Amino acid sequence: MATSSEEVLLIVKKVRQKKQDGALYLMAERIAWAPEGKDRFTISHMYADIKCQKISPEGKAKIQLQLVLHAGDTTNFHFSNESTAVKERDAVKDLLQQLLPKFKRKAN
C-alpha cells in the first residue's frame, strides 16, 4: 500500500507492457513497472487486487507473464530481456506466487 511496498525486492529489465518496453520492479506489497524513457512507474498493482498470474512458456518469440485480477482485468508483461527473461518470468512468478496469496483472498 504505502509502507513496505516502497522497497523493491525484485528488479526486472527490458519488460514490455502494452507495446512499451521498460523495467519491472516488484515491491513488498505491490508490483510496479517503469516504462523506458520515463522517470515514474506507470504500473502499480497491489497483490491484493491480483487474483492469479499467467506465465507464457517457451515457443513464443518472447517470454511473458500476466497479472490476472479479480477485477476482470489482466496486466500482461512481455519479458523482452533475452538475457534473463525466462528466469525473470520465473522469479516474478515465484515472488508473486509467494506474495500474491499472502495479500489476496480467494473469491471462493
Binding site: 492469479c52 498470474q53 507464457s56 518469440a61 518472447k62 511473458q64 490476472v68 506466487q97
Partner: peptide, 19 residues
C-alpha cells in the same frame, strides 16, 4: 488482438489457479 495487443498472449499458462 482485441483487448490485449501486447503481441501474442494465448499459450499463457496459469499457476495461481481460480482464486
Amino acid at each position: 488482438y482485441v483487448g490485449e495487443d501486447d503481441e501474442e498472449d494465448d499459450d499463457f499458462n496459469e499457476n495461481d489457479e481460480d482464486d
